[PDB]
Design a protein around this ligand. Structure first.
Ligand SMILES: CC(C)(COP(=O)(O)O)[C@@H](O)C(=O)NCCC(=O)NCCS
Ligand SMILES: CC(C)(COP(=O)(O)O)[C@@H](O)C(=O)NCCC(=O)NCCS
Lengths: 183, 81, 242, 78, 81
């Protein structure tokens, strides 16, 4: 119990510091961390269901911290990749920037996330069932993160916050309107 | 205001980015649903791009009404005037 | 406990084989190119071998202790991270190529756009696992340093040999060129939906995420390890007899 | 001419030496010492810390009764 | 519309209230950053007062662009026209 608390706190603080340093923004780092935490809760629920209710073998007492320490980091990495692309595409307007960033990264990030999830889930063929439980929990977590948090939650929050998503940096919501081109 | 040619050129560039249809294909008598084969989601993407570049806001209810390129050009000119 | 360690050490080869098979299948599905898959597999093998080699070398000279969980986690994490970094680099390079840039400019665009992201991801993974060093149970604590060192080695290999391999191979024929040129209508639709109507999509996503909390009230754990072992281990035979 | 950055240029210009160095180092590391399985087998760590009250209780019983000094036991069934 | 003199008089009164600079100092060629020494927060205060008195809305992004009093007067006249 105490180790799980310590690991969660330290990992969250370190990931927040790294994201704040890289993106040069506070609100973006907070959004990344919060979305990852929510995905973590969903992952725990799915894994508990799949094992305890379906299979019948409850989770081992050491599955939770091992799963958490990896889910946090990998989810944060994927969100960081998307946000980093968004920052490069943002000079054309927040909404168009988000659309271009999603079109650019989506396939790559989906392939990487699926590969990671199916690599983790392949540990279930082990004779030791604790390792299988850890692997399947991390796999379900990354699956849910990739398919929901990055695809829907993060860009929705970025659109809703608007210019506050990049605080304390100063960002135009939309560019200066331009004259129609002459053919 | 802006001439029909300028609006058509800008919309053709945006449509090229969104869908890939070449600008030469976009003529004011083309129907989005049939001639150009553009679904409603692509149309709302075009509206978002237009609002973020030229500052023209097109609500979804109006997007339902618009049928051909000429209709969109007329709508934009009406807003400008 | 002895049988638990024995089974953990026994199943490692099978785990590695299955992971490699699954990775090869998925890479073939994604890239549609055998040569691209072979290049990615070479990168993954280099990274994994470096990680396991450095961990084994440091462990042999009593720098730190080891457990079966630590070794399994090291292997799987090294494989996954190496594959992810290869996918990121090659994806950015192929996007730049498909845009129209030549191979030199495509390589430089790939590096400029993904160098910092790969490093940041690797540092997050390394620093997260290193927080296990501050726990009290030896099983958790002995995972911090090994995992961190392995992740650092994998990241260094991906950031130095990765670009080198990409630079060398792409020159020798149409190797890393995009096999299937196609845009992303699905991602266009998802982006437009997320931009136009963020409130509804956010509501749906948050509702979906909170569904998992319903499993919390019924959660419980057990400490009997004979439930987590196959029935043919000697300990389970003795337990059945007793 | 575009001012190419130093780092990617260095990686591109000396790619073959870098690849060869990496392969050589990895092979040397995997050859000098045994496999990870044997090292993990011979470097296993005790599950319970010495601060654990149960371990201290068992060792205390062992030393007070002057019988043993470990904390782990097995049962033989006939 | 409103003549440049009227806009300058109103802005001078508002600037006098916000910062204390006398109206005679405010001339259309003065730079806020250097000549008048007005920081950005004082400028957003001026924008708030202008919006609440004369009904002219100036977003912050535009406030960044505005440099001299003449620029603000031109912006207000453009909005009015
Ligand atoms: C999205 C769209 C414009 C697409 O129209 P189409 O069916 O003509 O392509 C139409 O379905 C619509 O107005 N839907 C109402 C709001 C909505 O669909 N939001 C997205 C659901 S999360
Ligand atoms: C407030 C200000 C206009 C001041 O600009 P200055 O640095 O040019 O004085 C600028 O910092 C800004 O737009 N900040 C973004 C929003 C903000 O600062 N809100 C207050 C923080 S609680």
């Amino acid at each position: 119990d105490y180790d799980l608390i310590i690991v969660a706190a330290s990992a969250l603080i370190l990931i927040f510091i790294i994201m704040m340093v890289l993106t040069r923004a506070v609100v973006a780092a907070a959004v990344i961390v919060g979305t990852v935490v929510l995905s973590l809760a969903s992952a725990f629920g799915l894994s508990v269901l799949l094992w305890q209710h379906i299979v019948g073998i409850p989770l081992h007492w050491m599955v939770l911290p091992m799963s958490v320490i990896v889910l946090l980091a990998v989810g944060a990495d994927y969100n960081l990749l998307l946000v980093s692309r968004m920052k490069e595409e943002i000079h054309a307007g927040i909404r168009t920037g988000i659309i271009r960033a999603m079109v650019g990264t989506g396939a790559v990030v989906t392939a990487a996330g699926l590969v990671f999830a199916f690599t983790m889930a392949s540990m279930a063929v082990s004779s030791l069932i604790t390792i299988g439980q850890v692997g399947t929990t991390i796999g379900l977590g990354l699956l849910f993160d990739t398919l929901v948090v990055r695809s829907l939650m993060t860009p929705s929050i970025a659109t809703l916050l608007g210019r506050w998503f990049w605080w304390p940096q100063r960002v135009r919501e939309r560019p200066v309107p331009s004259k129609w081109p002459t053919p | 205001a802006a001439t029909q040619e300028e609006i058509i050129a800008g919309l053709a560039e945006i449509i090229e980015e969104v869908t890939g249809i070449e600008p030469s294909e976009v003529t004011p008598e083309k129907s989005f649903v049939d001639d150009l084969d553009i679904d409603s989601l692509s149309m709302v993407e075009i509206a978002v791009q237009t609002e973020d570049k030229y500052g023209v806001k097109i609500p979804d209810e109006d997007l339902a009404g618009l049928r051909t390129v000429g209709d969109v050009v007329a709508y934009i000119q009406k807003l400008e005037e | 406990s002895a049988d638990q360690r024995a089974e953990g050490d026994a199943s490692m080869k099978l785990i590695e084989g299955v992971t490699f098979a699954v990775i090869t299948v998925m890479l073939l599905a994604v890239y549609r190119s055998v040569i691209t898959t072979l290049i990615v597999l070479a990168m993954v093998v280099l990274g994994l071998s470096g990680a396991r080699g450095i961990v084994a070398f440091l462990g042999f000279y009593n720098v730190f202790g080891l457990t079966t969980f630590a070794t399994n986690m090291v292997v799987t994490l090294a494989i996954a991270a190496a594959t992810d970094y290869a996918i990121f680099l090659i994806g950015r390079y192929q996007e730049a190529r498909r845009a129209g840039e030549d191979r030199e400019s495509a390589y430089y665009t790939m590096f400029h756009g993904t160098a910092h992201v790969v490093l940041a991801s690797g540092l997050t993974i390394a620093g997260a696992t290193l927080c296990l060093h501050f726990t009290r149970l030896p099983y958790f604590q002995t995972m911090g340093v090994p995992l961190a060192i392995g992740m650092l080695i994998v990241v260094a290999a991906a950031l130095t040999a990765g670009p080198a391999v990409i630079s060398v191979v792409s020159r020798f024929g149409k190797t890393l060129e995009p096999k299937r040129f196609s845009r992303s209508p699905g991602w266009h639709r998802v982006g437009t939906a997320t931009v136009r109507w963020p409130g509804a999509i956010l509501v749906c996503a948050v509702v979906a995420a909170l569904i998992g909390l319903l499993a919390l009230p019924g959660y419980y754990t057990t400490y009997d390890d004979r439930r987590y072992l196959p029935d043919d281990v000697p300990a389970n035979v003795g337990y059945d007899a007793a | 001419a575009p001012p190419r950055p130093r780092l990617p240029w260095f990686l591109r210009t000396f790619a073959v030496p870098i690849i060869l160095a990496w392969v050589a180092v990895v092979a040397i590391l995997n050859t000098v010492v045994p496999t990870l399985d044997e090292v993990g087998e011979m470097r296993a760590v005790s599950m319970a810390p010495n601060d654990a009250p149960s371990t201290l209780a068992i060792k205390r019983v062992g030393q007070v009764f002057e019988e043993y000094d470990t904390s782990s036991s097995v049962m033989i069934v006939l």
